[PDB]
Amino acid sequence: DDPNFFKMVEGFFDRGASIVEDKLVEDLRTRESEEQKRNRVRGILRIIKPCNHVLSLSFPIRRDDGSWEVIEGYRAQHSQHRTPCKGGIRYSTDVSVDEVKALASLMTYKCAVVDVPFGGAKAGVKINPKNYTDNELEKITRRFTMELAKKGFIGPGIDVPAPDMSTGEREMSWIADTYASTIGHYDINAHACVTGKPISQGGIHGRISATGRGVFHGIENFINEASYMSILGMTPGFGDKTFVVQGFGNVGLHSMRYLHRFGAKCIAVGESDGSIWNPDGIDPKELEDFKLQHGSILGFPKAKPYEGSILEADCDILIPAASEKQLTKSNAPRVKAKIIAEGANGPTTPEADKIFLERNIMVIPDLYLNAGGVTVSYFEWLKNLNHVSYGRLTFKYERDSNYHLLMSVQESLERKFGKHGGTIPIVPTAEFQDRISGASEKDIVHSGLAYTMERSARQIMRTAMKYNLGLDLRTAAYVNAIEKVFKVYNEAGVTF
Amino acid sequence: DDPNFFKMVEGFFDRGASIVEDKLVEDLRTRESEEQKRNRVRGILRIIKPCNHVLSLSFPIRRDDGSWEVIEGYRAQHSQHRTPCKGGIRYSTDVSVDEVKALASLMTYKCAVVDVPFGGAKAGVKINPKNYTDNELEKITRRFTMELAKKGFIGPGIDVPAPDMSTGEREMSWIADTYASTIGHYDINAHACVTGKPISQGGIHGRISATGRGVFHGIENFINEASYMSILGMTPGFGDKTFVVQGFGNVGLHSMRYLHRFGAKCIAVGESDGSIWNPDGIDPKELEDFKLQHGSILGFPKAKPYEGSILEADCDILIPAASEKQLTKSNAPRVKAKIIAEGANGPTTPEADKIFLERNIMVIPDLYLNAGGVTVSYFEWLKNLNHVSYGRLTFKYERDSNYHLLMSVQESLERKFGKHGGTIPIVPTAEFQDRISGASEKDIVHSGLAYTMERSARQIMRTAMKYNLGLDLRTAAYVNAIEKVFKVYNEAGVTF
Amino acid sequence: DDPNFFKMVEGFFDRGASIVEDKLVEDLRTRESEEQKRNRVRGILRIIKPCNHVLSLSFPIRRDDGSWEVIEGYRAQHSQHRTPCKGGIRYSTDVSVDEVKALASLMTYKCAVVDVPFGGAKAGVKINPKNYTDNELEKITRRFTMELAKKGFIGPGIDVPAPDMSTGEREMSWIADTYASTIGHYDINAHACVTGKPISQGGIHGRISATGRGVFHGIENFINEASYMSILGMTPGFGDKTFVVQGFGNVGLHSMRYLHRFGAKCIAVGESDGSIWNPDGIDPKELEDFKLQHGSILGFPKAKPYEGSILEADCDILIPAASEKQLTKSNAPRVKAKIIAEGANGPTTPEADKIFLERNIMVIPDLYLNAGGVTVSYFEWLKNLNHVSYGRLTFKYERDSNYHLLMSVQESLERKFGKHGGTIPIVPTAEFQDRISGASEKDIVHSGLAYTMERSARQIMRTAMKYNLGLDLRTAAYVNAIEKVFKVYNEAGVTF
């Protein structure tokens, strides 16, 4: 089947654009003919679809052994409506112009869903990182940054790179240092050229768990909605809920940790090399400790190895958080999970979606679910522009206000009841006291992430209801994104 | 009589400058002779008065019919003390250099009254907008922006245009797009080049009702001040208060809506083509619905047409919110309203002010009253610089703090009274619950607007008290503004 | 066969790079092993080959009928060694990334041959210009310029566009005006953003005949070289020389005009729709006048239509100045011309070159021959940077020096011979007098063009002699270009 960076993304836009065409024509305030309005709506939808800027590079590096190599790189920007763009850099041998174009378009709609004011971008360097030493990878990253900077593709007001799976926070420091040295110069905002930096460099707390927390909040919003749970025939809330996590990466680990924290039970954990199964439940902390020392999850005590395919395991909800095309037309009928939460990008095929829709299996789209990382990278970009950590000037002030409020209640009650009843001490609870003492930037970031996922989930539900979609949340997510990008471009003031 | 853009504004400064001259000399910490001090005070007051930069343009456009036209435009900046400047663009056939100069000076003092750190500016394009199509008006606006940008007159750190009566949010999009395309380039702050943009483009919620809310808060501050109400012989508060709104535009509609929301009664509504009168009261919602479909307010049921002049109607307070020179020396003696709230700009003549002062009629100045729009445009400018909507990172965090505070009260009370009394559930009230659920950026903007109008009203009262002025709030408003602009320039560090 | 923008250009580099590899290793001053030197030479040759920057665009325009269209454009820059780049813009439906990449590489070596300090560039807009009105083509050109400018692809110090066949001087004015309006701003050198402008805008005199003059000077250098003419068995000089021009475009017309001016005879003129033949000769002026009014050359008096193929006509030299692949393996054996002068780009196939080399037919490469246009565009770029026409400050000064020199000769002779012989008036000849009176910028430009073509021809001859090439001037031209680009990059100070 076609991969995620393939006509799937283009097909998603095409299906979404056709759906929104009728409504946009009707709700158009401009005075013109119906044919004139329909051409205008279809005309703008054609402008939105392609990536307006794509840069192809070829720059040399000299390897440690002394040989000479020419490295190809790409950077596709999808910004007809908003600047700056935001997108990761992928170091892989199979990157291509078509791939970065598709992923740049995908990031545009992902940012629109969570109301992040960024365009889409994506970079690719056609190397295999395992065949280069750390000294060589630094030279590749620095040289790639220089070529991007000279052509106006990496600036804080232009295009903000982000970490991908193949690039860590070490590479982001190389990008940030290179940008400031050459073209950032003495710009005050040059620190915000890149996101995913270490904490000491202006990075944000809670970035590691960002994608995992977003997955949890995405599920939580749809698990507490009575209308959807009635369709699935399940009780609202996480009470007596069992989930299976396919893949134990960064997303899978943190998603399980926050789900177990709220009463959910992990009855099985999948992996490429094996599977784990326990009806009683799997402790996220114990499994994490086992994985980091043994190098894998097989042989983990308190749970026998699973028999069969982890995807077909009986569970209330399922979390495919690794690889692509895990759910296909072949295995879709045997899936016993009422809810599928796409932690990874494109774990289900378009054919599989049709079977799930028939079987009344809610599939929370990857476009919305794993957007927690994009949201937090937006917060880090804001933090570097603010040049101050969140809450630094307000934590002490809010603490004093909270104690003044409690003293107001205490004094008011004491004079109401007089000497009778003695003194009524009003003190913060243990949970509140820990919140007051341990107040830090990560509390603000997690609060903002939870607010974004909650608000976007409500918008997707309204979009699904308006267009008479049922459990097809994927189309609703794309339709919701298409409308936002359409409105921004339509009112952008560009020449028509 | 002289219009608002006429020697009235110059006369207001001249009267205010003479009043403040004596006090400024005495409260001057510099060591010099009395003659040296008085020359310095008068010397700076001469620097403040004129507009330091005025640009006259003449640029061509080609009309749709193919003919050629040369359009004249102006942009006066009044910034000897602060940058950036802020001011609207007026499309009118009768604009002139003198008019934009006077309005640029007026905006400087209006910004100073509400503590908005902007200089004054004003633009004028000598065209009649009704004689041009939308395609032509876009070309005029874009070309006017390009000429302004090349001469350093439209930048976000230089001069921020604002919407006027003759220009809507559509024009602001044209200005913003033109600036970013040509000279804004990839500046991160290029979004803040203009205010009044649509919401999708970075506009701010609550801009439409901003001027109306400011009028309400301006009246409210002076209606609850016991000292002033004692002079007028009226009880404080809006209880049993009747008001008449002359003009039913954007300012008149929203001013009536918020006044009626707080117990005031609208007994009459004026208009150019007719008048409405009802001692029982007029519902703002019903009248608004009637106006938007019938195109006017005449023939509105539940109220007979008024007989005579709407300005002389018997009411507690009066709101002239349309046109100029409505209150003159001729009709001033017959006015039966104890309070006049200048919603529009210059609705009273200087001669009329003298009669009102004799009759003990408080006239809340237009310089302060209709400054709500300027304040909110300041907030929108800050929002575009912040690159995030207000409260996005704090709404969820504050909600959790509020619930922790209530749980602290509940647990403290429960352990105080033990099992006796059972559980004491502490939950937010219905009004608070709506505030928590419906929390949005417009709540922050309305809060900031109310704080600004409250603080400025207190400053004007102190200025009126210090200079022994009575009900002459107009002079107090100008005197208050003159002192602030004097202090900023005196301490600006410019060469003396 | 493969077109000119195809693996032909890549094949030319590959053959040339292999030839120069041996010599470059030997003449390397760095101290290292032979294997280390050979890797360094081969390593740099790999860096030179690809285009380092390629930009793909997709921007919208609205057609006059109101419909919406998305236009694709490309701009390939080939600059690892020199900046700025220089290259034309082609409006064609069949443009592609591979095509602009090949032509950008070709321009790099063409500039190197004539010692023009520019890198290679090429742009393509995938439209058919005949399907758009002049209003639409202006919007396409202006919008294409804006996108190029924002990404650093059109600046005077970055990349200077030039006119192609499909774009005239009208488009260059659109590009220049758009650049100055948006990003050129008030840069003093913003006038030099583009070349091929009209004279009033800073264009250079003699641009129209530049390519034709270069073809003449290219032939003249190789027609007066005794060594080459001995191989061909022809007398040096243009005396009793007959030439055939295939194609009567701008290049064909001017090439014939200057050849006939120096004694050569045009016995035949080819064309797509017909052919003209006259052993007596064809007057360039009469044929030009006939063409501009009848729209073609068929039916031209004083010459019967030619029978057969114009390429096989018996002539001393042949000038293919139209289309591509005119000389193939099929017709190569029947060609009766001793010299082939490639006025157009790629009129001979690589297979045809082998037959010509066997038959001792000298083929003057198109890489060098039609480089007159590139040289003059370099002069125009210098003129815009100088902000003064050539010779404006020197024509009068040199005229006075010339007359002083003649007066010195006259007075010296008069006193030598005394009264005997009377006066010896030393006056300029008629040819010199016309040169003095009609002195203008075009004289300087034509002088510089002739000097460049002469010097480059000598360099190509030395390169052909050094590498033991015979009449294979095409490989010598590429080998000469490869060495120059190699040396510039090797000594550029880039990291190795």
Author numbering:
A (entry chain D), B (entry chain E), C (entry chain B): 62 to 557
The authors write:
Here we report the use of single particle cryo-EM to identify multiple proteins from three enriched heterogeneous fractions prepared from human liver mitochondrial lysate. Using this approach, we were able to simultaneously identify and solve cryo-EM structures of nine different human mitochondrial enzymes: short chain acyl-CoA dehydrogenase (SCAD), medium chain acyl-CoA dehydrogenase (MCAD), isovaleryl-CoA dehydrogenase (IVD), delta (3, 5)-delta dienoyl-CoA isomerase (ECH1), aspartate aminotransferase (GOT2), glutamate dehydrogenase (GLUD1), mitochondrial superoxide dismutase 2 (SOD2), catalase (CAT), and mitochondrial aldehyde dehydrogenase (ALDH2). Functionally, the three acyl-CoA dehydrogenases—SCAD, MCAD and IVD—are involved in beta oxidation and amino acid catabolism.
Functionally, mammalian GDH uses NADH or NADPH as a cofactor in order to deaminate glutamate to 2-oxoglutarate, a key intermediate in the Krebs cycle. Each individual subunit consists of an N-terminal glutamate-binding domain (residues 63–266), the NADH-binding domain (267–448 and 528–556), and the antenna domain (449–501). There is a large degree of conformational flexibility in both the NADH-binding domain and antenna domain, particularly in the unbound state. Additionally, mutations in the antenna domain have also been linked to hyperinsulinism.
